[PDB]
Structure 1
């Protein structure tokens, strides 16, 4: 899994209400969060399946 999978979820400075997924490295799986709609960081996926495919590790 890429190192970016260990960053905490980043909502960003915008105030839209976009449900995304991030990988939670302590939990070992992806959880939802409200993305504000700008300035995303890489641990930010449109589905749990994409999030796990990228971060769920070897």
Structure 2
């Protein structure tokens, strides 16, 4: 599922605050996304992340 993938920064070099679902903690946590690539466990807000993965 998208919610089980680890948070991926990607090869781009920006530091954009995004959210991913952390299976261990069982909730969404923030991470810095590089701006391109990565995977689907990458959401704009904590709320969106929870609506999809919570």
Normalised to the residue count of structure 1, the TM-score between the two structures is 0.89
Separation in 2 of the partners of 1:4 and 1:16? 22
Provide the alpha-carbon RMSD of the alignment: 0.6
Gaps in structure 2 of 5+ consecutive residues: none
Instruction: Give the corresponding residue for 1:7.
Output: 5
Gaps in structure 1 of 5+ consecutive residues: none
Q: Structure 1: which 4+ aligned runs deviate by more than 3 Å?
A: none
Aligned length: 54
Which has the greater radius of gyration?
1
Normalised to the residue count of structure 2, the TM-score between the two structures is 0.95
